[PDB]
Design a protein around this ligand. Structure first.
Ligand SMILES: *[C@@H]1O[C@H](CO)[C@@H](O[C@@H]2O[C@H](CO)[C@@H](O[C@@H]3O[C@H](CO[C@@H]4O[C@H](CO)[C@@H](O)[C@H](O)[C@@H]4O)[C@@H](O)[C@H](O[C@@H]4O[C@H](CO[C@@H]5O[C@H](CO)[C@@H](O)[C@H](O)[C@@H]5O)[C@@H](O)[C@H](O)[C@@H]4O)[C@@H]3O)[C@H](O)[C@H]2NC(C)=O)[C@H](O)[C@H]1NC(C)=O
Ligand SMILES: Nc1ccn([C@@H]2O[C@H](CO)[C@@H](O[P@](=O)(S)OC[C@H]3O[C@@H](n4ccc(=O)[nH]c4=O)[C@H](O)[C@@H]3O)[C@H]2O)c(=O)n1
Ligand SMILES: *[C@@H]1O[C@H](CO)[C@@H](O[C@@H]2O[C@H](CO)[C@@H](O)[C@H](O)[C@H]2NC(C)=O)[C@H](O)[C@H]1NC(C)=O
Ligand SMILES: *[C@@H]1O[C@H](CO)[C@@H](O[C@@H]2O[C@H](CO)[C@@H](O)[C@H](O)[C@H]2NC(C)=O)[C@H](O)[C@H]1NC(C)=O
Ligand SMILES: *[C@@H]1O[C@H](CO)[C@@H](O)[C@H](O)[C@H]1NC(C)=O
Ligand SMILES: *[C@@H]1O[C@H](CO)[C@@H](O)[C@H](O)[C@H]1NC(C)=O
Ligand SMILES: *[C@@H]1O[C@H](CO)[C@@H](O)[C@H](O)[C@H]1NC(C)=O
Length: 158
């Protein structure tokens, strides 16, 4: 039901993907998304200490040097509060999701690509745990998930 999506390293992609590459990080959680998007004032304002407890998840913002907690707070604000109600179970799920990402599932399906001409590969910049229509992927080419070459848009290797 919930989509779990993450960023993957890619030196050719400006932003978190390049920062991940430079830091030797392969996979960094973007979010866990139920159907309902939260609107309005959150029931609880996520603190830095709470958001830092999602170990390994790098912020997509350069304003924190891709650390914490802009993306982490945006995730709680847009997808967290109205679905989980309390930050504690949401922090636990996000943290455990990220721990699996750092270690590894794999149930890894490409979401967005940067087609690299020099390698003739669809470099995956974001992936999720269920198949989805692709964006920026060249049809017929192979997929590179943080250096792992796969034939299709879905990767099953640890
Ligand atoms: C996919 O994403 C969905 C979110 O869309 C997620 O479901 C949510 O899971 C979280 C748990 O991780 C649920 O949060 C709990 O919700 C309770 C209220 O639930 C009610 O029932 C319905 C569920 O079907 C829901 O629709 C209703 O609106 C309704 O509100 C909270 O009670 C709960 O708090 C937890 O307990 C404490 C409450 O206190 C009790 O008393 C004491 C005193 O503190 C406690 O010690 C005791 O243990 C009691 O529980 C809180 O203080 C505490 O922090 C605690 O953690 C918690 O917030 C949420 O309802 C689910 N939402 C929906 C819409 O289903 C799925 O898990 C996701 N699945 C995967 C696989 O990712
Ligand atoms: N005030 C701010 C500042 C930063 N941020 C977050 O940090 C990113 C960089 O500014 C934003 O990208 P976002 O704006 S969502 O997207 C811009 C670009 O980044 C991409 N992106 C965004 C988030 C993420 O996790 N991974 C990722 O590739 C997105 O696809 C697009 O190409 C947000 O995720 C925010 O939420 N609010
Ligand atoms: C993190 O990874 C583990 C290993 O895949 C997941 O645990 C398995 O989950 C399935 C279904 O829920 C079950 O068959 C087993 O009980 C678990 N197996 C082992 C070996 O632990 C776990 O669900 C993952 N957590 C998150 C948040 O994704
Ligand atoms: C979040 O997940 C991390 C793993 O990235 C947890 O760190 C573990 O902490 C325990 C102590 O409780 C250590 O014994 C384990 O070996 C840890 N693993 C690593 C890699 O550090 C952390 O406990 C979790 N935090 C929350 C709030 O759930
Ligand atoms: C990473 O990207 C920059 C391009 O902005 C480049 O100058 C550098 O050579 C790259 N490093 C590798 C290992 O590809
Ligand atoms: C960003 O963080 C990295 C890695 O921890 C460090 O190498 C770099 O100097 C930082 N950049 C700034 C501008 O502080
Ligand atoms: C990241 O990905 C490569 C390709 O599978 C792997 O060989 C390397 O050990 C990984 N780095 C981390 C930090 O897990």
């Amino acid at each position: 039901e919930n989509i779990t999506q993450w960023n993957l390293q890619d030196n050719g992609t400006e932003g978190i993907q390049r920062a991940m590459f430079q830091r030797g990080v392969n996979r960094s959680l973007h979010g866990i998304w139920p159907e309902k998007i939260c609107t309005g004032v959150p029931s609880h304002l996520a603190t830095d200490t709470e958001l830092k407890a999602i170990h390994g998840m790098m912020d997509a913002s350069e304003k924190t040097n891709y650390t914490c907690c802009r993306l982490q707070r945006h995730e709680w604000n847009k997808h967290g509060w109205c679905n989980w109600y309390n930050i504690e179970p949401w922090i636990l799920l996000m943290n455990k999701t990220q721990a699996n990402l750092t270690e590894g599932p794999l149930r890894e399906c490409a979401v967005t690509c940067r087609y690299d001409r020099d390698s003739d590969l669809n470099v995956v910049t974001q992936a999720r745990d269920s198949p989805t229509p692709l964006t920026g992927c060249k049809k017929g080419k192979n997929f590179s998930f943080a250096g792992i070459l796969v034939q299709g848009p879905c990767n099953f290797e640890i």
